């Protein structure tokens, strides 16, 4: 999996509250987190499916 998948979820500086998915490398599972709306990092997905397809593989 890409190295960015190992980075912790990044909420960012903006202040909206929208649910996004991130790959939790420690749990080996894609989970949800609160994204702030701007300056998203790559470990930020709009669905568990996309998160898994991108970060699931070893």
């Amino acid at each position: 999996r890409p190295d960015f998948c190992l980075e912790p979820p990044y909420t960012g500086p903006c202040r909206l509250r929208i649910i996004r998915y991130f790959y939790n490398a420690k749990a080996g599972l894609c989970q949800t987190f609160v994204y702030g709306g701007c300056r998203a990092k790559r470990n930020n997905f709009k669905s568990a499916e996309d998160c898994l397809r991108t970060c699931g593989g070893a």
């Binding site: 500086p13 202040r15 909206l16 509250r17 929208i18 702030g36 701007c38 300056r39």
Partner: protein, 223 residues
């Protein structure tokens, strides 16, 4: 809103909630069919919720009206966050006054030190996570452009201003974006961004509405 307090029942009638399945941004009603919010709050299929302090109640005193048009400022920059403002037209007119009234646009910009009212249904914890069921309010003064730029070197444009306390403890937070910053009965700011929430030397940054009055009026008149 962190370090704030439960707003008085219907004390913030111009406050609205932008919904996309659930509350994600705040907004300010400027007339019967137009709402002002942050540009980063743009999403397709937005529905506006008005007139209800409690964000979860359905069939209470609230009104759900679909957005028919969502116009983001044409120069919004998602990297610098410059020009972070958006206009939303409601599909139908909302019932005004009682628990739903518009907020007047400024005729002139406010000054540092001016006390303002910030509100929203955002996070109430600076470190943890606790979203409220009722609308929260906060009294915060506008900070000098000088201390704003010192707090965020190279990040503050002429279309932004800081409000809050450098000591931390009081500030807007995730879930408050797009919300109003009212100073002396005038909409001078829009919740935009900040480094974390309620952190020392990291005050909230807000869109400077007084700089877009002309854009707002002309946009509303042409659409």
């Amino acid at each position: 809103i962190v370090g704030g307090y439960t707003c008085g029942a219907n004390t913030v009638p111009y406050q609205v909630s932008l919904n996309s399945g659930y509350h994600f941004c705040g907004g300010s009603l400027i007339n019967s069919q137009w709402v002002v919010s942050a540009a980063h709050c743009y999403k397709s299929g937005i529905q506006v919720r008005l007139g209800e302090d409690n964000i979860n109640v359905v069939e209470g005193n609230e009104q759900f009206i679909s957005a028919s048009k969502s116009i983001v400022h044409p120069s919004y920059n998602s990297n610098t966050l410059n020009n972070d403002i958006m206009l939303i037209k409601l599909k139908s007119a909302a019932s005004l006054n009682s628990r739903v009234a518009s907020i007047s646009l400024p005729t002139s910009c406010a000054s540092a030190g001016t006390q303002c009212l910030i509100s929203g249904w955002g996070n109430t914890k600076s470190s943890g996570t606790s979203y409220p069921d009722v609308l929260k309010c906060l009294k915060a003064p506008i900070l000098s452009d000088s201390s704003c730029k010192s707090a965020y070197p190279g990040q503050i444009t002429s279309n932004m201003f800081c409000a809050g306390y450098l000591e931390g403890g009081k500030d807007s937070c995730q879930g408050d974006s797009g919300g109003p910053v009212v100073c002396s009965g005038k909409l001078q700011g829009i919740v935009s961004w900040g480094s974390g929430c309620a952190q020392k030397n990291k005050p909230g940054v807000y869109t400077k509405v007084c700089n877009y009055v002309s854009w707002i009026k002309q946009t509303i008149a042409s659409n």
